Write a protein that holds these residues in place. Structure first.
Motif, PDB file in Angstrom:
ATOM      1  N   UNK A   1       0.734  -1.209  -0.023  1.00 15.90           N
ATOM      2  CA  UNK A   1      -0.019  -0.082   0.306  1.00 15.90           C
ATOM      3  C   UNK A   1       0.920   1.317   0.003  1.00 15.90           C
ATOM      4  N   UNK A   2       0.398   2.243  -0.810  1.00 13.93           N
ATOM      5  CA  UNK A   2       1.115   3.480  -0.852  1.00 13.93           C
ATOM      6  C   UNK A   2       2.606   3.606  -1.166  1.00 13.93           C
ATOM      7  N   UNK A   3       2.755   2.612  -2.114  1.00 12.38           N
ATOM      8  CA  UNK A   3       4.520   2.630  -2.573  1.00 12.38           C
ATOM      9  C   UNK A   3       4.543   2.868  -3.797  1.00 12.38           C
ATOM     10  N   UNK A   4       5.805   3.339  -4.452  1.00 15.05           N
ATOM     11  CA  UNK A   4       6.183   3.612  -5.748  1.00 15.05           C
ATOM     12  C   UNK A   4       6.900   2.459  -6.403  1.00 15.05           C
ATOM     13  N   UNK A   5       6.129   1.892  -7.574  1.00  8.71           N
ATOM     14  CA  UNK A   5       6.649   0.692  -8.642  1.00  8.71           C
ATOM     15  C   UNK A   5       7.074   1.474  -9.641  1.00  8.71           C
ATOM     16  N   UNK A   6       7.950   0.462 -10.368  1.00  8.11           N
ATOM     17  CA  UNK A   6       8.592   0.704 -11.847  1.00  8.11           C
ATOM     18  C   UNK A   6       7.759  -0.017 -12.744  1.00  8.11           C
ATOM     19  N   UNK A   7       7.733   0.492 -13.983  1.00  8.84           N
ATOM     20  CA  UNK A   7       7.307  -0.663 -14.911  1.00  8.84           C
ATOM     21  C   UNK A   7       7.746  -0.280 -16.381  1.00  8.84           C
ATOM     22  N   UNK A   8       8.165  -1.097 -17.291  1.00  9.72           N
ATOM     23  CA  UNK A   8       8.820  -1.075 -18.448  1.00  9.72           C
ATOM     24  C   UNK A   8       8.509  -2.015 -19.548  1.00  9.72           C
ATOM     25  N   UNK A   9       8.424  -1.837 -20.686  1.00 13.98           N
ATOM     26  CA  UNK A   9       8.587  -2.705 -21.751  1.00 13.98           C
ATOM     27  C   UNK A   9       9.947  -3.229 -22.168  1.00 13.98           C
ATOM     28  N   UNK A  10      10.382  -4.316 -22.000  1.00 17.92           N
ATOM     29  CA  UNK A  10      11.770  -4.976 -22.130  1.00 17.92           C
ATOM     30  C   UNK A  10      11.721  -6.220 -22.846  1.00 17.92           C
ATOM     31  N   UNK A  11      12.980  -6.420 -23.535  1.00 19.53           N
ATOM     32  CA  UNK A  11      13.172  -7.733 -24.109  1.00 19.53           C
ATOM     33  C   UNK A  11      14.506  -8.290 -23.466  1.00 19.53           C
ATOM     34  N   UNK A  12      14.476  -9.619 -23.041  1.00 14.34           N
ATOM     35  CA  UNK A  12      15.835 -10.211 -22.383  1.00 14.34           C
ATOM     36  C   UNK A  12      16.944 -10.250 -23.566  1.00 14.34           C
TER      37      UNK A  12
END
Length: 109
Positions: A27-38
């Protein structure tokens, strides 16, 4: 335990906007997101769309995200590794932070 959805995730077009939904995260936290390829042990992600979001008291968040069929990609520290083609490379949209990895959802164009 948290839920993470990305839709649509197939029959995609370059520049198409998809929906991202997270629930049950911290709850109430910052997350990160991205489109990636290994590639080579590291993720080559699109630096133009890689971003962050905060969750509400229930550990939820939702927002739109633009996917790219191909793009110039970079590793987590900002190093460019050239270009990635998602018509052949296994691209996914992934979210998380230091405390919890929310998962990966595969993308198909």
């Amino acid at each position: 335990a948290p839920a993470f959805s990305v839709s649509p995730a197939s029959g995609l077009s370059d520049g198409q906007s998809v929906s991202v939904s997270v629930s049950g995260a911290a709850a109430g936290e910052t997350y990160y997101i991205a489109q990636c390829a290994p590639v080579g042990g590291q993720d080559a992600c699109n630096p133009a769309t890689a971003t962050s979001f905060t969750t509400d008291a229930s550990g939820a968040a939702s927002f739109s995200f633009v996917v790219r069929k191909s793009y110039t990609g970079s590793t987590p520290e900002g190093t460019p590794v050239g270009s990635v083609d998602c018509a052949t490379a296994a691209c996914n949209l992934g979210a998380g932070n230091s405390g919890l990895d929310l998962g990966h959802v595969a993308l198909t164009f």
